[PDB]
Design a binder for this molecule. Structure first.
Ligand SMILES: [Ca+2]
Lengths: 57, 223
């Protein structure tokens, strides 16, 4: 199972931190709100990191 | 904050916003040089914004001061969320005034049923997303450790408490983390985590500040 194909995970913490995830339906790295803890792997600090890791999934 | 109300400009003068190019967490001012927030709010390059009401506009009472130190509790566990507290030192001292003021640390823990004030610029919807311009407030009670553990089996440590309403509708939410839970003029909690926002049977979980008072005072004094 490709972690790049998992939906983005906000998690239980209550921050509003903007992260990137690869959106395989759109074929692009997109922003989402991360709550600050228990990140899954489809969660990147920049578009560049997301594209490097997941681009083309 | 879901299910709350507009506080009114500068009515919660200890509330700060943590900014990293946008608002991502709250915090509480505890003296002119130091803020308490959550450990999961750690980021490099934090700017603390004091005296805010509308966080999308420059209104006239703001002070924007960079963090010079952002000190996460040395036993923070990023998996269990135990010890979810962080101290931020301001690079220069805030100018204290009626709209920028410190909140007292507790002298003893608060009991179940004590009514508190929770505040922040987090999401106001339990389903969907709406982020407010102005600061929101919620009155909510501390809940018993037993009810908290029943809501979240295996997850509640001695350094956490639950607060809120089991019927749903009133809770902290994304963007409120790090901010205050104040009870009878004392900072008793820090917004930490939950399960969704404002859902039935899923109250918010808060860092139990009364357990950290000695650590907070000594860490501040040592830095
Ligand atoms: Ca403002």
């Amino acid at each position: 199972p490709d972690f790049c194909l998992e939906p983005p995970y906000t998690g239980p913490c209550x921050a509003r931190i903007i992260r990137y995830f690869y959106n395989a339906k759109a074929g692009l790295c997109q922003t989402f709100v991360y709550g600050g803890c228990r990140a899954k792997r489809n969660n990147f600090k920049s578009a560049e990191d997301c594209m490097r890791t997941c681009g083309g999934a | 904050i879901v299910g709350g109300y507009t506080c009114g400009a500068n009515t919660v003068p200890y509330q700060v916003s943590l900014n990293s190019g946008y608002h991502f967490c709250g915090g509480s001012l505890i003296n002119s040089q130091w803020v308490v927030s959550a450990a999961h709010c750690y980021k490099s390059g934090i700017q603390v914004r004091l005296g805010e009401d509308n966080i999308n506009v420059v209104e006239g009472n703001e002070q924007f001061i960079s963090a010079s130190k952002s000190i996460v509790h040395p036993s923070y566990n990023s998996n269990t969320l135990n010890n979810d507290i962080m101290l931020i030192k301001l690079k220069s001292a805030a100018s204290l005034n009626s709209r920028v003021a410190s909140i007292s640390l507790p002298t003893s823990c608060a009991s179940a049923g004590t009514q508190c004030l929770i505040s922040g610029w987090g999401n106001t919807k339990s389903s969907g997303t709406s982020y407010p311009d102005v600061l929101k407030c919620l009155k909510a009670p501390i809940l018993s450790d037993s009810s908290c553990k029943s809501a979240y089996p295996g997850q509640i440590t001695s350094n956490m408490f639950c607060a809120g309403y089991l019927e749903g509708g009133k809770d902290s939410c994304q963007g409120d983390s790090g901010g205050p839970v104040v009870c009878s003029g004392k900072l008793q909690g820090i917004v930490s985590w939950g399960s969704g926002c404002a859902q039935k049977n899923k109250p918010g979980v808060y860092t139990k500040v009364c357990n950290y008072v000695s650590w907070i005072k000594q860490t501040i004094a040592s830095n």
